[PDB]
């Protein structure tokens, strides 16, 4: 039951994030780093630290034979994989538990029902959740693509099913421009993801993403910490997340937990994940996927919840019971930048090393970072310097506050984005609330 | 409304004066920061709106410098001023001065301030309001003999305390008459010295006392709130090392009567701005006033963390002429500590004067670190050997206990010792966990 020692499969912010719970709970934290990642802060931190093989990027933390000896060799019990790498990694999930180390996670059925996107809107039209219009599962190959477009009218949007990252997906005006966009996405995910599988809904035009965290627990119970607007994205990528999302109403708001916690129940869900939802102009929201998992953006819901979720993850495996939904009160309003090494406007990368390091402090800011002064950022690799956080009584005082933190992140060396939050936070568009997922892309 | 403040002068330094900078900024309004020559390093300066140098450094003395602080108010066009604590945060004199160049005090009116500030005094209004106080001398003592006469009477041991006293200096613990006159003259001395005022009082001397305090923000309404009681009790030379929120020595019936004397005591000297009240507690869980400070202190993060209060905020909008928050709305959650890291040898104390060559600041979930510090700045240990506050806030005491251990773990410091290594062997001091300590702790130990 209890677990005494847990492995952080994994690296960076979400590394340091991590070990703080773990070590305040009182169990030992074990950190794995790769030859290139030996600067690591969190490494000085952690209980035992093993290196696990050469930088290769990822290739190291993607050794599941490496990961599996470490956490014997230091006698973890438990393994917390965060996000990316092996935390959706059906295979190492059964080969912990082959192992007799606990996976920090769902078990691998309810990951396989929601792994290929496609079929799992397929699982949720089961379980009454509202899925956009489109394909009955993959596309069995263009011509069918074709015959589909036509019936549900463009414009349509040509996703992989085994897509993630913003990747594999192709926006379909016309019908002169099918076939082209169905093998550029359908060679993407071969080569990403190595499956080409496709599938395709109505594109809603100008939607929000908002999102639901829940967490499950071995009794059958799933609560909500909320939801998240994450719809400032480029690249159908975040950079800005908030919680909560003030475009709701209070009924839309209830009927989308409801919607979220439902969903878990109907698929047997334990541990953390997230149930994404895009919501059109007159409210009515869709499903669109589900992740297995902890993600990035989970801080901005411990900020308006109380919750520490990783530490609700953690017991959640030990076989404890979650708090219950009445016992979780969410408050004020959490907004997060994501501060990366990349240019403020060409968001091109800028790898280097830091000279100066200031981070932001005060009440309720929260900068979740593993950098320090004289630290290298693999910008080219890893360019995330860090998650600025802050929380206040409402949206506004929260954007009042993210703007001086902003203003007092002072990091020199290489360049960040911290000057394009700056201009978010004065844009009155976003003031007003008036984005969407596409907003970006034509400003 | 016509007192809406535009534009807010910090007249302090240091982690204070970075603090309140943080809150002015997110009200929107303009903070303007001063500095003596030595202080040109300062982080906050970076941040201002505008920074003025008043003078060479001394030490404090061009922060103490009057006409200086006036002038860079009116040439920044500051239409409010921020005291902080020390330096001129009780000077009634100032007080006074930036009301005759229409520059609004972010703080009481020099009446409160007055009623306060001889403790002798002080416990005499107490006493009027119907406030607990320790038994003593009836106001100041005329001298020796008169201390001598009042000690039988009130019975040995006593404390001797200077009326115009602060900083933990002054006081003289009398256990025996023998010790009495040397006791005394010794007091005065210190006293004449460091206040300019030799004027003594007396009280029992409580045994093994535990040191609690009420925050408190009064509006010019009337109203007055609280925002819960800290327990200061782990002190050195009679000055706070570590403080908490709530203080568990305290049942419910206790704390309640507490937080009621403290709004009652305001009430009746007509307090407006943030103050707190001092009391300490015997062992029988009696408490007594023992002073009040008529400005904020540097332990308000404590207060701050479990009431969701941001106080200084609270100030402001007082000085705005806003009406305070209900009491009602005021819900005090979990348990709060913060450790004042200093530049000092944790076994010693000695000041441990020199340039950071490492900085690395913890942070998480619920942590609150509040320095000025930053990687390469030299600290004047000689003179302010703060390095910062570390703050944390857990859902119970024991959980805020393991996360000020993490969080005292992965603060980083190079080039200078700290108390780093003293907070953390007080954190897992078993007398700390138990609750079983006092004013007088260190000492014994
Ligand atoms: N049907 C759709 N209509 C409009 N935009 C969409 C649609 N599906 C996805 N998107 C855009 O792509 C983003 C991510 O989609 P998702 O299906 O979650 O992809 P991934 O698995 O790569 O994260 C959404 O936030 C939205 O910006
Ligand atoms: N009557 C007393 N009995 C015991 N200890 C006292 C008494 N008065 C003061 N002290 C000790 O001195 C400390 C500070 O007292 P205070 O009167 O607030 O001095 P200051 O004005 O210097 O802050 C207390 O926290 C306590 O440790
Ligand atoms: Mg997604
Ligand atoms: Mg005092």
């Known amino acids: 039951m209890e677990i005494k020692s847990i492995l952080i499969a994994n690296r960076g912010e979400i590394a340091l994030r991590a070990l703080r719970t773990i070590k305040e709970m009182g169990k030992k934290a074990i950190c794995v780093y790769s030859e290139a990642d030996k600067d690591a802060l969190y490494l000085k931190y952690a209980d ?5 093989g050469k930088a290769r990027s990822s290739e190291s933390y993607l050794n599941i034979p490496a990961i599996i000896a470490a956490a014997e060799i230091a006698e973890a019990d438990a393994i917390f994989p965060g996000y990316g790498f092996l935390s959706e990694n059906q295979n190492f999930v059964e080969i912990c538990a082959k192992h007799n180390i606990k996976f920090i996670g769902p078990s691998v059925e309810a990951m396989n029902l929601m792994s290929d996107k496609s079929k799992a809107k397929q699982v949720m039209q089961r379980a009454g959740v509202p899925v956009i219009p489109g394909s009955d599962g993959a596309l069995a190959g263009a011509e069918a693509a074709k015959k589909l477009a036509k019936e549900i009218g463009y414009p349509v949007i040509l996703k992989a099913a085994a897509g993630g990252g913003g990747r594999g997906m192709r926006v379909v005006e016309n019908e002169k421009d099918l076939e082209k966009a169905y093998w550029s996405a359908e060679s993407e995910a071969m080569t990403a993801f190595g499956d080409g599988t496709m599938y395709m809904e109505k594109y809603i035009q100008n939607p929000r993403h908002i999102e639901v965290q829940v967490i499950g627990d071995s009794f059958g119970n799933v609560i909500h910490v909320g939801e998240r607007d994450c719809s400032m994205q480029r690249r159908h990528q975040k950079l800005i ?7 709701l109403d209070e009924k839309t ?4 937990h409801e919607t979220a916690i439902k969903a878990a129940k109907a698929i047997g869900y334990e541990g953390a994940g997230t149930f994404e939802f895009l ?7 869709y499903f669109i996927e589900m992740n297995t998992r902890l993600q990035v953006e989970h801080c901005v819901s411990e900020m308006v919840s109380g919750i520490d979720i990783i530490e609700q993850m953690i017991k959640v495996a030990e076989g404890y019971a979650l708090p219950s939904q ?13 501060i990366t090494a990349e240019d403020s406007k060409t968001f091109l990368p800028s790898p280097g090393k830091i000279t100066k390091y200031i981070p932001p402090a005060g009440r309720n800011v ?29 949206r506004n005082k929260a954007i009042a506050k993210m703007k001086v933190a902003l203003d007092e992140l002072l990091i020199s060396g290489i360049k960040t984005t911290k000057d394009f939050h700056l201009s978010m936070m004065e ?6 609330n008036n984005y969407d997922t596409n907003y970006l892309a034509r400003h």
């Open 366 to 394: 929260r900068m979740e970072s593993h950098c320090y002064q004289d630290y290298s950022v693999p910008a080219y690799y890893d360019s995330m310097i860090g998650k600025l956080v802050v929380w206040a009584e409402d």
């Open 48 to 52: 035992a630290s093993i290196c696990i």
């Open 279 to 285: 919501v059109d102009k007159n409210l009515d929201f």
């Open 253 to 256: 708001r209830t009927r989308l």
């Open 326 to 338: 009445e016992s979780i009160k969410l408050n004020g309003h959490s907004i997060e930048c994501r």
């Open 427 to 432: 844009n009155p568009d976003f003031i007003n």
């Open 241 to 247: 997340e908030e919680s909560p999302a003030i475009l």
